[PDB]
Ligand binder design. Structure first.
Ligand SMILES: [Mg+2]
Length: 333
C-alpha cells in the first residue's frame, strides 16, 4: 500500500482523490491547499463537469473523512515545511502549478517524501512520462518526475504508433479543447496579458498556443522536433479532441492506420469506431481514445497526407494517467 500526499486540491487534485479513495492499494494521508477546507469539501462533493461525488465527505478540524478514511488537511505554502516524513509519505502528487520544476518540487523530498509526480510539464532535466508509452524509463533511484500534459497523454500513444509502424516524419496538431479556468468569464484584463484568454470563454472559438507537440521528444525521443501545433478553445466545460495531420515514410490506407491503432489498444489508449461526440468522453478512464471514424488518407501525385484524431477528457483522462504513473513509480524497487 502506497502512502500518497496531494499538494493542491484543484481540479486535478480532487479528481485524483476520487480515483484513489476506494483503491486499497493507495493510502491518501494528506491534502495540502491554502483554501478554506469548507470550500474545498464543497468543490469535492459537487462538480459541474464530472458530477456528484459518489460517496461521503465530512469536514473536521484539520482533516476530511472521505468514505470513512481520515485525511489530514494542511495549508502551508512552502513544501519543505510539510510533514511528509512524519506521515511516511511514499509519493507526492504535485498539482499546485507553482512547483513545475525538478528543483522546486524537490522541496517535497526535503520534507520527507520519497518521490514526487508533477501534474504538468516541468522541464527537460527530469523524466517525463506518459503511462503505457514510456513509463519503462523510470528507475527506483528517480525522485521527481513529470506526468507530462493532458494533451501529451492524448497525443503520445497515437503518435507512437505512427512513428513505429509508419515512420512519421512531421506533423501538425490541432486540439479542439474545452475552455479552462485561466480564461476569463467575461471580457476583462488577463493576468498574463493574453489578449485571447482575456475574452469571454463560453462565447467563442478562441485560438491558443500549445506546448505538447513541440515537447513530444521528451516522451518519444525519435519524434523530437518533428511535431508542432496549437489549440482552439471552444465553449465546452471538459472533453477535448486532438487532431494530427502528418506525413509518413510508408504509403498507408485508412483501414491500415485504424488496424495499427486498435492493435496498440491498452487501458491508457482506447479504440472506437462509434460516432461519439465530446460529451461522451467525459469521465473516461482512457488517457486517449482513438476515433477510427476520423481517419483520412489523401494522395496527390504519389505523396500522401494523413489525418487522425483521438478524444480525451482533459481532466479525468489525464488524472487516470497520473494515477497509473504514480502507482507504478511508487512500487519500483
Ligand atoms: Mg488543477
Amino acid at each position: 500500500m502506497v502512502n500518497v500526499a496531494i499538494n493542491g486540491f484543484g481540479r486535478i487534485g480532487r479528481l485524483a482523490l476520487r480515483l484513489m479513495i476506494n483503491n486499497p492499494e493507495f493510502n491518501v494521508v494528506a491534502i495540502n491547499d491554502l483554501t478554506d477546507a469548507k470550500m474545498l469539501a464543497h468543490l469535492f462533493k459537487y462538480d459541474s463537469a464530472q458530477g456528484r461525488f459518489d460517496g461521503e465527505i465530512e469536514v473536521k478540524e484539520g482533516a476530511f473523512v472521505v468514505n470513512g478514511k481520515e485525511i489530514k488537511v494542511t495549508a502551508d505554502a512552502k513544501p519543505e515545511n510539510l510533514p511528509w516524513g512524519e506521515l511516511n509519505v511514499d509519493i507526492v502528487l504535485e498539482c499546485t502549478g507553482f512547483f513545475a520544476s525538478k528543483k522546486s518540487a524537490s522541496a517535497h523530498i526535503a520534507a520527507g517524501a520519497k518521490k514526487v509526480v508533477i501534474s504538468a510539464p516541468a522541464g527537460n532535466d527530469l523524466p517525463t512520462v506518459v503511462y503505457n508509452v514510456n513509463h519503462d524509463i523510470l528507475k527506483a533511484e528517480d525522485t521527481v518526475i513529470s506526468g507530462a500534459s493532458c494533451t501529451t497523454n492524448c497525443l503520445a500513444p497515437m503518435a507512437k504508433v505512427l512513428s513505429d509502424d509508419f515512420g512519421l516524419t512531421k506533423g501538425f496538431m490541432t486540439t479542439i479543447h474545452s475552455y479552462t479556468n485561466d480564461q476569463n468569464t467575461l471580457d476583462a484584463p488577463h493576468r498574463k496579458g493574453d489578449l485571447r484568454r482575456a475574452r469571454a470563454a463560453a462565447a467563442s472559438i478562441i485560438p491558443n498556443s500549445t506546448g505538447a507537440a513541440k515537447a513530444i521528444g521528451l516522451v518519444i525521443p525519435e519524434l523530437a522536433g518533428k511535431l508542432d501545433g496549437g489549440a482552439q478553445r471552444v465553449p465546452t466545460i471538459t472533453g477535448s479532441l486532438t487532431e494530427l495531420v502528418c506525413t509518413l515514410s510508408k504509403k498507408v490506407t485508412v483501414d491500415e492506420v485504424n488496424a495499427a491503432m486498435k492493435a496498440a489498444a491498452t487501458e491508457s489508449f482506447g479504440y472506437t469506431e462509434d460516432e461519439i461526440v465530446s460529451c461522451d468522453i467525459i469521465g473516461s478512464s482512457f488517457g486517449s481514445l482513438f476515433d477510427g471514424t476520423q481517419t483520412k488518407v489523401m494522395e496527390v501525385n504519389g505523396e500522401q497526407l494523413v489525418k487522425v484524431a483521438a478524444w480525451y477528457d482533459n481532466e479525468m483522462s489525464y488524472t487516470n494517467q497520473l494515477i497509473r504513473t504514480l502507482g507504478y513509480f511508487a512500487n519500483l524497487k
